[PDB]
């Protein structure tokens, strides 16, 4: 992976690539790494994919249960605490590196959560194997209280640097923009990589495979 | 206080007028037992208990109703002595747990609250019965001053300047209201505690009695101690002299 988050003027931008790997082979060219926690909080995930999915779903479930009881919009601190205290309890065996971001009644908040259960609160965070490349862009180009379109450009460039430089990262750039009154889940925000068109034809024609046995079962 | 077709058989059962009779009957146990008093002076707390001797065959010091809960905390009991000792053990353990966790002597008001919560827990269920015991707790500190608390079978905890529990509790409290304890030294209080006990004691109906005395204050360097024989015997001489 490459996942990154930014705090801008109006709220939060979250970014992620779409590459999943098994060994040194690409398993999924288009996987969703920005996860729903609540209608106002989203969470990026890196590391062990299955750990990423289940940890992000359990906390999302637990917050809905919480927000139904309170009748209030859930807080990014609660998402932070829930994720932190779990990942710590499992001594880092749940391999989930997280970029948590959302907008509260308190305002815009961004967190980075480590598999061992250590959290940081920062204006810009990067996680994943492409984090160094993404963090380099932020250190060079980040400015305080920037505009939405400008922050969208920044995060996408950070993800791009992770894609074109980290072998564990590739394919599409995903974005999630969260403000006080709006949420944009931009799935394919940018498609910087495409498969070359097959100008040679290898379509195996009908009757080119030898069959030994055939059974046809009809249905409703 | 009457209806008892149920209602009064379990502590988990309210009476139609909203009372827990099992707690009230547990309070009757302390009402039948002999009187115990404690007075908060300017520089400490003094305890006094009328210990009724059932037989002259018992040693002087048997059935001691004065207890050391912590090196700085004293305990005077009234009611069912079996429950009293087990409540002292609970108080002992609560006081030692505090030192083992926080490194200092447990503040009396916190110890009193903790123990009272335990007392209260025995008033809610059919599985257990309330303690038939009222107890007082006394302590003195240079930072907190003199402190005196009393806990009844229900689990209620209050701070006192003077307090009486037992057979003649109402009779004793009228004698303590005569004293200016806030200005008195705990050396003078011993004399007055002994007097109140002797007055309240029933000469004809109850037999002979032993007077038990303890104190904690400036005079005893903050440690809860039994009042020395020479000072105790002086107060007994004085208390009998008050009976003119």
């Amino acid at each position: 992976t490459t996942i990154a988050g930014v705090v801008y003027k109006d709220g939060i931008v979250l970014g992620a690539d779409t590459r999943a790997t098994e060994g040194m082979v690409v398993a999924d060219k288009n996987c969703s790494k920005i996860h729903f926690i609540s209608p106002n909080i989203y969470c990026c995930g890196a590391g062990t994919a299955a750990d990423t999915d289940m940890t992000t779903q359990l906390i999302s479930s637990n917050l809905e249960l919480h927000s139904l009881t309170t009748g209030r919009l859930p807080r990014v601190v609660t998402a932070n605490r829930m994720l932190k205290q779990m990942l710590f309890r499992y001594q880092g065996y749940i391999g989930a590196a997280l970029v948590l971001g959302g907008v509260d009644v308190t305002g815009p908040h961004l967190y980075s959560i480590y598999p061992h259960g250590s959290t940081d609160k920062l204006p810009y965070v990067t996680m994943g194997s492409g984090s160094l490349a993404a963090m380099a862009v932020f250190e060079d180009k980040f400015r305080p209280d920037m505009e939405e379109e400008e922050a969208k450009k920044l995060v996408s460039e950070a993800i791009a640097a992770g894609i074109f430089n980290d072998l564990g990262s590739g394919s599409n750039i995903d974005l999630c923009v969260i403000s006080k009154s709006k949420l944009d889940f931009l799935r394919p925000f940018s498609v910087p990589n495409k498969k070359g068109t097959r100008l040679g034809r290898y379509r195996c024609e009908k009757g080119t495979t030898a069959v030994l046995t055939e059974k046809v079962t009809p249905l409703e | 206080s009457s209806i008892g077709t149920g209602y009064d058989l379990s502590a988990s059962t309210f009476s139609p007028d909203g009372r827990v009779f099992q707690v009230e009957y547990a309070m009757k146990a302390v009402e039948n037992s002999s009187t115990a008093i404690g007075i908060r002076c300017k520089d400490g707390v003094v305890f006094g208990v009328e210990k009724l001797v059932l037989s002259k065959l018992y040693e002087e010091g048997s059935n001691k109703r004065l207890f050391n809960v912590d090196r700085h905390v004293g305990m005077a009991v009234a009611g069912l002595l079996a429950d009293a000792r087990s409540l002292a053990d609970i108080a002992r353990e609560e006081a030692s747990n505090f030192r083992s966790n926080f490194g200092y002597n447990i503040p009396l008001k916190h110890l009193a609250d903790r123990v009272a919560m335990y007392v209260h827990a025995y008033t809610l269920y059919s599985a257990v019965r309330p303690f038939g015991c009222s107890f007082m707790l006394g302590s003195y500190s240079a930072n907190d001053g003199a402190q005196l608390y009393m806990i009844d079978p229900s689990g209620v905890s209050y701070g006192y300047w003077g307090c009486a529990i037992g057979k003649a509790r109402q009779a004793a409290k009228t004698e303590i209201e005569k004293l200016q304890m806030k200005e008195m030294t705990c050396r003078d209080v011993v004399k007055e505690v002994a007097k109140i006990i002797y007055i309240v004691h029933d000469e004809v109906k109850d037999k002979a009695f032993e007077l038990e005395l303890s104190w904690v204050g400036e005079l005893t360097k903050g440690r809860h101690e039994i009042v020395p024989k020479d000072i105790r015997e002086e107060a007994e001489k004085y208390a009998k002299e008050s009976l003119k």
């Binding site: - | 050391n68 809960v69 912590d70 090196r71 002992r92 030692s96 030192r99 083992s100 039994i226």
Partner: protein, 216 residues
Amino acid sequence: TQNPMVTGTSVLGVKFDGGVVIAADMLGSYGSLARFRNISRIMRVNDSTMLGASGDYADFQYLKQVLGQMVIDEELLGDGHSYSPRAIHSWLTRAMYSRRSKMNPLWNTMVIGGYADGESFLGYVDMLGVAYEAPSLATGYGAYLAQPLLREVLEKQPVLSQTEARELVERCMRVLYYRDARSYNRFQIATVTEKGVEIEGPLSAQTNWDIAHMIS
């Protein structure tokens, strides 16, 4: 404790005519670093018995808390019974072996000193539960340096006066400072007597360094 952290080095003890004297420097070493230069490694148990501990200081602080409470619990009853030095020694053997057998040892080596009913007590306790009595005791490097000197004197003179025992310890603490690299020239002297237990403030051993000039 699997790995000790802040540790104390040698603890010494020798009984004399009248009571027992125990010595220990006031250092808590963190490996080769001398981190805590002002810590007490001797505790008063009760009026008749005291304790000095080698090894992990955090574990010593635990035992100090547990024994501390035990003595308090006895003095509550006021029945006229109190733990003898031999009793505390017995209890400590039971505690240390129990933890050893749980494969979670208290990383300590104790010296118990006491005076009760005319005779003076001196006992040793391992982190494994090895316990015995001896007229002189030394832990850590003290075993290799101080104890030899302590035994040599007791060979010539089995019974010592308080002064003779005290200045012997002075001599032993001087050698330890020369030769042990985890020691410190700031120690406490603890003494059990008929009067009770006294621990004395910061003490330094006078050192000689004349041998510097005679190399050539």
